[PDB]
Each structure stands twice: as structure tokens, then as C-alpha cells.
């Protein structure tokens, strides 16, 4: 990307990395993938 | 509600810029913690 | 130990609303930063 506006404009939210430095960018599937207790609740794409 | 997240044995990470709250799952985190193709669960 | 996490290369963030630390991996970050089924890494 180019700026912190681009990720927000893209819709993807951005979380601040405290230990390591940087800005991890989170998308809808990435969050939807991430929020999963077990194999059952993963996107149809995985 | 946020309490329902913890009751599900689920932790949650705040977002500084534009998310507010992102819920983080133990399968997801274990997926999220991965260098290469080697360290992802059998489900993936 | 946290240094082992950093020395390995994996970053880490802070879980505020309940929990400790989740550790971000290289593939996971790419996995996490995916909009649609054609934006996540090849392995998944």
C-alpha cells in the first residue's frame, strides 16, 4: 500500500503491533478466518 | 456483547485505526502464528 | 520467552480485552491481510 488512508479506504482495518514494531493489516476473511474455535467455522474458501 | 466473547473462552484484540475490536481465535491465532506451509493445522 | 519470539522473527501484539499475547507469523499476516479468496497466500 501507500498510506494509512489506503488500508482504511480499502476497508481493511489496521492493528498496531506493540512487540516487534509494525502495523498488521486485517481483512474481512482474515478476521473471519482468525475468529474460529475449530475447523467447522472457517470460510468456504478454506 | 463483549462478555459473551470471554464466556466462549475467546480473547479479543483492540484496533487502533479503524476496527475498534477484532476477536482472535485459538485456531486462528495458531493459524496466524505461522512462518511457512509447515506450521498450519491439519484442518488447513 | 518473548525474545525467542522476536529472535525467530515473529512479531507480537497485546490482547487487551482478556488474554495475553498472540504472536503474528509471516504466513498468518498474509492470511490475515486477505480480502477475498484470491488474496490469501497459495498454501491456504
Amino acid at each position: 500500500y501507500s498510506d494509512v488512508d489506503a488500508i482504511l479506504a480499502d476497508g481493511k482495518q489496521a492493528v498496531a503491533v506493540k512487540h516487534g514494531g509494525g502495523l498488521v493489516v486485517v481483512g474481512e476473511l482474515g478476521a473471519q478466518v482468525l475468529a474460529a474455535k475449530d475447523v467447522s467455522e472457517l470460510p468456504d474458501g478454506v | 456483547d463483549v462478555d459473551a466473547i470471554l464466556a466462549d473462552g475467546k480473547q479479543a484484540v483492540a484496533v487502533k485505526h479503524g476496527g475498534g475490536l477484532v476477536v482472535v481465535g485459538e485456531l486462528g491465532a495458531q493459524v496466524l502464528a505461522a512462518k511457512d506451509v509447515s506450521e498450519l493445522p491439519d484442518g488447513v | 520467552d518473548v525474545d525467542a519470539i522476536l529472535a525467530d522473527g515473529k512479531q507480537a501484539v497485546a490482547v487487551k480485552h482478556g488474554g495475553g499475547l498472540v504472536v503474528v507469523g509471516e504466513l498468518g499476516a498474509q492470511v490475515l491481510a486477505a480480502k477475498d479468496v484470491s488474496e490469501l497466500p497459495d498454501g491456504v
Partner: protein, 370 residues
């Protein structure tokens, strides 16, 4: 309402300190690194002295610059004596060696959190006081094991009961490898060569009826379990060996938490004494020994000198450690993007601990009893 709420709470007392008082500190500068080094010098005759400079008095190099070393054998010393002929061409060519001692400083800390709801709608309104009291007391406790773990690990004098040589050797199955009166005196004899000086002077004797006179001794720290074995311990003359503390209380001064004395040791009981739990032999038919966690449990017997514990304090002002606390009370103090309401609190205790164990002649003898 179904019951009456009594306000006063039952709070456990803090375990009394026994090891932190015997250590001396060495200040470590800030701007420089995290290690301290020493150059310990050894005697020329000591067998530790190894050096290339070793030319024989009447000859060439023999790779031994310590003459007869520490042989102490009359069949050896005359041969290795620095005999010199009339022609003084070459001689023993003694060498000297110094020992490098390295000490490290590590970091340790705490933290715990509480919500405003927990403090507000709780049955007891003194929750904050109880938490900080329990927190700081535990920090005092944890610091003690930091010291004790190192002291137990580092001890040149390690005598094993019977014919045992390692922790695994010890067992209670057959002839239980326990402390004998013979074993204790040898540890003092080994300690009598040097390092550990005589902690206390010998007791002359006071005018009484039952009082006995004891010799100069060195404090030996023991766990509570092994105390009984020391009590019922027959001397060579089938009499008692554990002189009770009361029999010399009138004459000499008393060290804190004393139970008695054996030979050249005054017994000190420490409530929090770490042990080698489940490190002996497999307990097939354990004959009623309290030492049983999967395998036999090995208990220590520690005798610290006065030159074997140099605790390094990073910025600690003449103390083994300082605790650095940080309280963020719920409210405006903890208002941020994470919680824009401030319904969270935080307290963290950080500290820096390190030890050296210079001149490692502390005595640590094991025992499997009870």
C-alpha cells in the same frame, strides 16, 4: 439475610527470611554491560595451578609447574623437592595461574490487573489492601528462592551419605542413605581446611545445672523434616549428639531459629527449604519414608560460609534487590483507544537479581529420611 458477616479476615503470616540477610552486595555500573568478572588467584603449590612453564630443576620441561602439587604424601614430596646442585643453571621454573569468575544479572517481574466492578461490588471493602499485601509478600518470598536455588546449586563441598555419589544413587529401599554422625563431622573437617571461617566462638560454660559446653561451629541450614533424625542421633559413645539449644542458652548468644548443635555445626531450621523432590530411586517398597514423589525425595543440608555469596545489584542501593512497582488505578489514568472508559487497573513489580558464588566452598550434603 441468613448469616452475619464478620469483618476481620484471616490472613496468613509471611514466612520469616533466613537467607537474604547473609549476602553482601557488589554495585554494578549502569552504562556498561550485564556481567561482572573476577580474577581469583591460586597458590603455587595448589593442584589447581597448571602452567606451561615447568622446566625440571635438573633437566627439561615436565609440564608440571607446581612442584609436588598438593600430594601431601611423604613418598612423593622428597622426590619433587626443588633440590639444586652447586651449578645454578636452571631450576623448577614455577608458574602461576589466575581463575576467571563470571557473574550474570537477570530480570524478573510481576503484574496483575483488576476491574472497577470487582473493587466496587464486592462483599469485602478491603480487597485492595489484601491484594497488595499478598503481592508484595510473595515478591519477598520469590526473591528468597532466587538466592537459595543458586546457593544449593553452587557448593564445592558435596558429601553423600554411605557409598552414594549422585542424587539418583540415594534410596530408602535397602540400607537408607541417611545422615550419620560420622558424616557430619567430616563435612566440618573438610570445611576446616579453609574458606568458611568459624561463624561463632566456642561456648565456655555458664553456672547452671543442666548446661553443656559446645565448640565453635558454623550454621547449617536444614529442612524441618530432617530435624528428627538429627535429634535421635547416637554419638560414638551411644549418648546423644544433638545438644538441645536450651542447654547452652544461658551461656552463649543465640542465632535466630536455632534448634541445636552437632559437632562443628549449629542447626538452623528454615520453614521454606527447597528439596530435591522425586530425584532418588524408584520407590518399589518404600519403607514408610516421607521422601516419596514418584521416586525418593532428596533433602539438602546447607552450610554457607562468609565468602561464597556475592549478590550483584544492578541499581539496588546496597540491597540484594529493589522492587519497582507501578500502579495505574482505574479511571482517567487508564483511558485510551483500547478502553475509552477506564474500567481497568494494573500493578506490576519488577526487580533484578544475580549471584556470584565466589570461592565455592559452601557445604551441601544430601539426605533421604523421614
Amino acid at each position: 439475610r441468613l448469616d452475619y458477616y464478620y469483618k476481620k479476615a484471616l490472613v496468613d503470616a509471611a514466612k520469616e527470611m533466613y537467607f537474604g540477610q547473609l549476602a553482601e552486595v557488589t554495585n554494578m555500573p549502569k552504562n556498561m554491560g550485564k556481567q561482572i568478572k573476577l580474577y581469583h588467584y591460586v597458590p603455587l603449590l595448589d593442584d589447581r595451578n597448571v602452567n606451561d612453564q615447568g622446566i625440571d630443576a635438573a633437566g627439561a620441561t615436565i609440564a608440571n609447574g607446581n612442584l609436588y602439587g598438593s600430594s601431601k604424601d611423604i613418598g612423593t614430596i622428597p622426590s619433587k623437592l626443588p633440590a639444586l646442585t652447586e651449578n645454578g643453571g636452571r631450576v623448577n621454573r614455577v608458574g602461576f595461574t589466575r581463575i576467571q569468575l563470571i557473574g550474570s544479572i537477570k530480570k524478573f517481574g510481576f503484574f496483575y490487573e483488576w476491574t472497577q466492578e470487582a473493587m466496587d461490588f464486592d462483599t469485602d471493602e478491603e480487597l485492595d489492601s489484601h491484594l497488595i499485601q499478598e503481592a508484595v509478600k510473595g515478591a519477598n518470598e520469590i526473591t528468597e528462592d532466587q538466592l537459595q536455588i543458586d546457593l544449593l546449586n553452587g557448593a564445592g563441598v558435596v558429601r553423600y551419605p554411605g557409598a552414594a555419589t549422585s542424587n539418583a544413587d540415594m534410596t530408602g529401599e535397602g540400607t537408607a542413605t541417611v545422615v550419620t554422625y560420622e558424616g557430619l563431622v567430616k563435612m566440618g573437617i573438610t570445611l576446616n581446611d579453609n574458606l568458611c571461617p568459624m561463624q561463632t566462638k566456642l561456648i565456655a560454660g555458664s553456672l547452671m545445672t543442666d548446661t553443656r559446653t559446645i565448640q565453635g561451629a558454623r550454621a547449617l541450614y536444614i529442612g524441618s523434616e530432617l530435624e528428627l533424625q538429627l535429634r535421635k542421633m547416637k554419638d560414638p559413645f551411644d549418648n546423644a549428639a544433638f545438644i538441645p539449644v536450651q542447654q547452652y542458652a544461658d551461656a552463649g548468644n543465640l542465632l535466630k531459629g536455632e534448634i541445636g548443635s552437632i559437632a562443628s555445626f549449629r542447626v538452623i531450621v528454615v520453614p521454606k527449604m527447597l528439596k530435591w523432590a522425586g530425584a532418588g530411586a524408584t520407590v518399589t517398597t518404600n519403607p514408610g519414608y516421607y521422601a516419596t514423589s514418584g521416586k525418593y525425595d532428596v533433602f539438602p543440608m546447607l552450610c554457607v560460609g562468609s565468602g561464597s555469596f556475592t549478590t550483584i545489584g544492578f541499581q539496588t542501593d546496597g540491597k540484594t534487590v529493589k522492587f519497582t512497582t507501578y500502579t495505574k488505578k482505574p479511571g482517567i489514568e487508564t483511558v485510551s483507544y483500547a478502553d475509552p472508559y477506564g474500567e481497568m487497573g494494573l500493578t506490576s513489580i519488577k526487580w533484578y537479581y544475580g549471584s556470584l558464588i565466589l570461592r565455592p566452598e559452601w557445604i551441601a550434603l544430601f539426605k533421604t529420611v523421614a
